[PDB]
Amino acid sequence: GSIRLADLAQQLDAELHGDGDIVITGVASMQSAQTGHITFMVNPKYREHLGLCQASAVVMTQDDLPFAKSAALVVKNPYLTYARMAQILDTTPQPAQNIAPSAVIDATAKLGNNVSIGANAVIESGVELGDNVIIGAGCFVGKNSKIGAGSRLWANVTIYHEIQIGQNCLIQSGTVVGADGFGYANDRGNWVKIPQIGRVIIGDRVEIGACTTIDRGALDDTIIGNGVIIDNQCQIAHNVVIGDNTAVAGGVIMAGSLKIGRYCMIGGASVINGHMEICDKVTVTGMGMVMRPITEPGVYSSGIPLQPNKVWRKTAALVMNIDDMSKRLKSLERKVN
Amino acid sequence: SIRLADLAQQLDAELHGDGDIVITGVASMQSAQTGHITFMVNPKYREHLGLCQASAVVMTQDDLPFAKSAALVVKNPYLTYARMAQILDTTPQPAQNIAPSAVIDATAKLGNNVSIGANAVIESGVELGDNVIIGAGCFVGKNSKIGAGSRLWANVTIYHEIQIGQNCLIQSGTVVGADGFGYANDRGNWVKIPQIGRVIIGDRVEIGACTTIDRGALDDTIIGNGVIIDNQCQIAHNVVIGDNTAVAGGVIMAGSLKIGRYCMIGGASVINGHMEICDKVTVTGMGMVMRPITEPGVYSSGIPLQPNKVWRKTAALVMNIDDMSKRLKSLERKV
């Protein structure tokens, strides 16, 4: 929705320098910005390049101001301001509007005010959708699950039974919340399935990317804290607990009964062992092989990165044979001494 | 809900205490209340069993001296738990009856007690066995057959010409029978190889969520009886998995791999193709399986996590390990 520059500036707590009556219609990158767009500068090396930007307005800092070649919005944090102004000017549609005639909604489902449910979505008995909830097309929401006000599911999301989701969450398409995890007794090499009768409890302001899977707990619950952000194609196993505000990047695999503390950052493609704890304020860099509990905050890493294939072949062969290298070292140490 | 004594009879357990206790469900030791049965396997819990408020605790004979409530003594408490949980199971069905919004081709063949959920789509020629349940929003492609007692949760996709045995369970988001990744190459341009093989899934197979199993190129991808496959797995075209093998989450398998019976593939492993893994192999998590495995046992790979400052030195030294090896050889020569 178009907005006057002065009004946008006010909503952003920004100091306006230039024509408050400029009409901003959208956000754009510095190189793509055209007339009507607002953009932002986080890197002062672009100062000399601002005359090449066709935006009607640029978010920058007080130190950048003398360099502006446009109306400027002066803020302390241009990046945070960009996030805020992109929200105000967001062109992202809603996943649905009103209740589609093709949705199948059980008579016992309780719908709050202003709930939208897209075409061919399916809502089971006992489901409760709070005010302003939006369910995209093709979704499934299982028996007695509860979705708090303002939460939104994109198309083709699957929520199983007895799932609790908080307020102002967002779940991208293909994601599955509350499947049965691995739970088997071995009876003479034959697997005996254990019903998984715990739940998933997802807090408020949680964002979950696409094709992520979160299993329900075996007896007690899988728990996602408030403010957690989870990227695409993560596996969150039964009885995992993720503390508030933790970030999990794409493709992370967690085993059952892992507990992750608050404000952690789990880099993409990491692989995390179960029945153990990672404390608050831990960062695992990408592809981390987390076999053991982490009990101190800080940054942890693993992995031997890419080499030219000819080089890699020697590296891998020497590492695989490193015990023999170590013995040779020990015996050269004795021979010298 | 079941009387304790009736339950202990079905479980072949030696009851120690009031058999008239009504059991309504299973619960963890920490959570159990009046009405719940629970179990223990770790002797660590013995000291505080008086803090457990379950009506009954499944345990072994060596536990009974510590019991502080009715007990069911058994040899395998964990297997007894699986069984009593099946008896007391509360999980709903993916669907009940045939939804009027389901779309079912006229040539589909359905058995007794088939349920089909809302907006599911069943293609021409499909055959669904007795007691088969198809969750909401599923797609079942042309001529596919699903054996008796099998169940698909919501939003499962089964392609055409797929065969699934009896008493299988497939969780949401999973795709069975997509094209294998087969291409010829014509001067740098990829040329699709149509994948006209199938997937054959045995009896009693459990598959997780957002898993993909590709159809074979000409002959079939084969999943043996009793196999269990977790979430986020990729099973490429013409893979063969032997009976009772278990594959954990996020495992990625390349084409024409053969896995034996009774294997255990740890999460996030990567198994290369055109090779064979024999029976009774365990691969631990993140295993980089490059070569055939011909002997049973446990196999592992990977250099595990360290503090980042330490990792930087570890990885730099490893990357330069050839120089280290040459300097060791030079030193031996000089000495």
Binding site: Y184, G256, M291 | G266, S269, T284, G285, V298
Partner: peptide, 5 residues
């Protein structure tokens, strides 16, 4: 064991 039940 690592990533196993």
């Amino acid at each position: 064991l690592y990533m196993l039940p």
